[PDB]
């Protein structure tokens, strides 16, 4: 997250860190949202590589013991069947991870609530992106979980020629684009939390930013629109 602030450690208890095994260590690669005690929602592109993945719930500082973490292996990966890794612009950038164990819930570990199917946010709706991704274009990962306030940009504006044009689809949410605050590499897969009727819900799964940089004016961060995939998510969980 470029232009973020440090999150309070109990603000976003559905945020997870998706990590891969790297030598004798683990490396953060993506975010995700805990949606059942044994299921995480993330981006499909996060799990393109043939790696050994784990999820960390209750994580705040990637580099220090928080005293709240639970570490769990990924047992099964179900990528959306229409996903195509060389065409992120087509959409379908979503995957479900079944965890090897069910995590225990507490103030640091909670299920993300998802929007009702079909919900579309008004332009300029209030949302926060969260994650450990780069804090500058071509920078380094955050140590502590970051948040940035990223107002939505509706489809009509986001798909206009000076924004994303054809690349953004109605199955996506755009947010931000002010040139200061954005998602960045390592935030993919994590949540966009939007405040609706007094309750935050996870309306987006972070999917992509500009090839020209993270915080680029009129290139809002682009998220998979969770409310377009409710039936898919429910069908996957029911059949696994
Ligand atoms: Na930690």
Curated annotation (Swiss-Prot):
Cofactor-binding details, from the entry: Binds 1 Ca(2+) ion per subunit.
Q: Could you say which cofactors this protein requires?
A: Ca(2+)
List the InterPro entries: Peptidase_S1_Elastase_sf, Peptidase_S1_PA, Peptidase_S1_PA_chymotrypsin, Peptidase_S1A, Trypsin_dom, TRYPSIN_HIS, TRYPSIN_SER
Kindly list the cysteine pairs connected by disulfide bridges.
30-46, 127-194, 158-174, 184-214
Which Pfam family name is an example for this entry? Trypsin
One BP annotation, GO: proteolysis
The record lists the catalysed reaction(s) as: Hydrolysis of proteins, including elastin. Preferential cleavage: Ala-|-Xaa
User: GO cellular component annotations, sorted alphabetically?
Assistant: extracellular space
Q: What PROSITE patterns does the database record attribute to this sequence? A: TRYPSIN_DOM, TRYPSIN_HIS, TRYPSIN_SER
Start and end residues of each Peptidase S1 domain: 1-238
Q: Which residues bind Ca(2+)?
A: 59, 61, 64, 69
**Annotated keywords:** Calcium, Disulfide bond, Hydrolase, Metal-binding, Protease, Secreted, Serine protease, Signal, Zymogen
- Stated EC number for the protein is 3.4.21.36
The places in or outside the cell where this protein is found are: Secreted
- A molecular function GO annotation: serine-type endopeptidase activity
Q: Which residues form the active site?
A: 45, 93, 188
* Top-rank taxon: Eukaryota
Tissue specificity field: Pancreas. Basal layers of the epidermis, hair follicle and sebaceous gland epithelia (at protein level).
- Going by the record, the broad EC class of this enzyme is hydrolase
What family does the database annotate?
Belongs to the peptidase S1 family. Elastase subfamily.
* Known role: Serine proteases that hydrolyze many proteins in addition to elastin.
- Please report the name of this protein according to its UniProt entry: Chymotrypsin-like elastase family member 1
Which species is listed as the source? Sus scrofa (Pig)
């Amino acid at each position: 997250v470029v232009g973020g602030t440090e999150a309070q450690r109990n603000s976003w208890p559905s945020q997870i860190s998706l990590q891969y095994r790297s030598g004798s260590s683990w490396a953060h690669t993506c975010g995700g949202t805990l949606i059942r005690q044994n299921w995480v929602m993330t981006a499909a592109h996060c799990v393109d590589r043939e790696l050994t993945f784990r999820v960390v719930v209750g994580e705040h500082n990637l580099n220090q013991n928080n005293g709240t973490e639970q570490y769990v292996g990924v047992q099964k990966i179900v990528v959306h069947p229409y996903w195509n890794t060389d065409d992120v612009a087509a959409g379908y950038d979503i995957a479900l991870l079944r965890l090897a164990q069910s995590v225990t819930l507490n103030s640091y570990v909670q299920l993300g609530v998802l929007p009702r199917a079909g919900t579309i946010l008004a332009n300029n709706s209030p949302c926060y992106i969260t994650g450990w991704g780069l804090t500058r274009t071509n920078g380094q990962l955050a140590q502590t979980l970051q948040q940035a306030y990223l107002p939505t940009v509706d489809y009509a504006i986001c798909s206009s020629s000076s924004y994303w044009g054809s690349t953004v689809k109605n199955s996506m949410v755009c947010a931000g684009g002010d040139g200061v605050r954005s998602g960045c590499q390592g935030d993919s897969g994590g949540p966009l939390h939007c405040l609706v009727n007094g309750q935050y819900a996870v309306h987006g799964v972070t999917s992509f930013v500009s090839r020209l940089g993270c915080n680029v004016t009129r290139k809002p961060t682009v998220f998979t629109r969770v409310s377009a995939y409710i039936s898919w998510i429910n069908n996957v969980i029911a059949s696994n």
